[PDB]
């Protein structure tokens, strides 16, 4: 049957736009430790050369209502989870890798003479700018419905009061949240996994013999160039 987007499940944002009259496969990402500003990772050429999806993997930390979030804000002083997501709830994305939370930033770029607020990864979830709110793209759904997989979403910022946006310009496709309510698809990369079993994305060490062998490339400063 049709699955639903449960909390505490890994996920990846997704969008598409036309540059040569073709729906390019794109996804948001960010390096984290270094340039904190987010950047766009193309994936349309995945058949002929694969992308780097490790940084792209986001995680749903929790979700709640707007008024409950405001009460959490007022109650700044500090269970089972898996609450199903509904439209109008205040989502909270998180970078699975860097452990830095997605948020808006009080910056500007490209000199639009207008708010851009280039999105990035805040170092801590404290403060109200970190939180985001979902909304429905297609009219066939409405507020309060149980959000499913595949349907298009319209993420909105809480504090900035600005909508996520794929900004096409002269340069590379910027993802500043400035102008337009872009149809942001929401691909579940993974979900609750079984204990003690292998899945994609998990990094592992290959053993041989009984225990005392490991596949590896030679260390650096070597004549083989580590190949």
């Amino acid at each position: 049957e049709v699955q639903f987007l449960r909390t505490d499940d890994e996920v990846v944002l997704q969008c598409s736009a036309t540059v040569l009259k073709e729906q390019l496969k794109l996804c948001l990402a960010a390096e984290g430790f270094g340039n904190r500003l987010c950047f766009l990772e193309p994936t349309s050429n995945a058949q002929n050369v694969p992308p780097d999806l490790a940084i792209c993997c986001f995680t749903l930390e929790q979700s709640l209502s707007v008024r409950a979030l405001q009460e959490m804000l007022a109650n700044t002083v500090e269970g089972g989870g898996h609450r199903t997501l509904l439209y109008g709830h205040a989502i909270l994305l998180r970078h699975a890798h860097s452990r830095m939370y997605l948020s808006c930033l009080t910056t500007s770029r490209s000199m639009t003479d207008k708010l851009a607020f280039d999105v990035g990864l805040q170092e801590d979830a404290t403060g109200e700018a970190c939180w985001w709110t979902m909304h429905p793209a297609s009219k066939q759904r409405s507020e309060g419905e149980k959000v499913r997989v595949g349907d298009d979403l319209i993420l909105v910022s809480v504090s900035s009061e600005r909508y996520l946006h794929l900004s096409t310009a002269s340069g590379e496709l910027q993802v500043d949240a400035s102008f337009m309510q872009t149809l942001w698809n929401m691909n579940p990369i993974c979900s609750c996994c079984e204990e003690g079993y292998v899945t994609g994305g998990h990094v592992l060490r290959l053993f041989h013999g009984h225990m005392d062998e490991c596949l590896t490339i030679s260390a650096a400063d070597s004549d083989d160039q580590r190949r």
């Binding site: 207008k114 504090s159 009061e161």
Partner: protein, 49 residues
């Protein structure tokens, strides 16, 4: 001339209160920040001068 003067009349008039909500509530700060961005300073002074 009349159109832009009326437009800034609306935009200037709808500031958050005078000082009541500005001294603490967040809605006033958000509205004032977006309000200052669209028509930044060092353009009013040229036009009035």
């Amino acid at each position: 001339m009349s159109f832009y003067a009326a437009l800034i009349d609306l935009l200037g008039r709808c500031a958050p209160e005078m000082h009541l909500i500005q001294a603490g509530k967040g809605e006033a700060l958000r509205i004032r920040a977006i309000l200052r961005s669209l028509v930044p300073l060092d353009d009013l002074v040229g036009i009035i001068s």
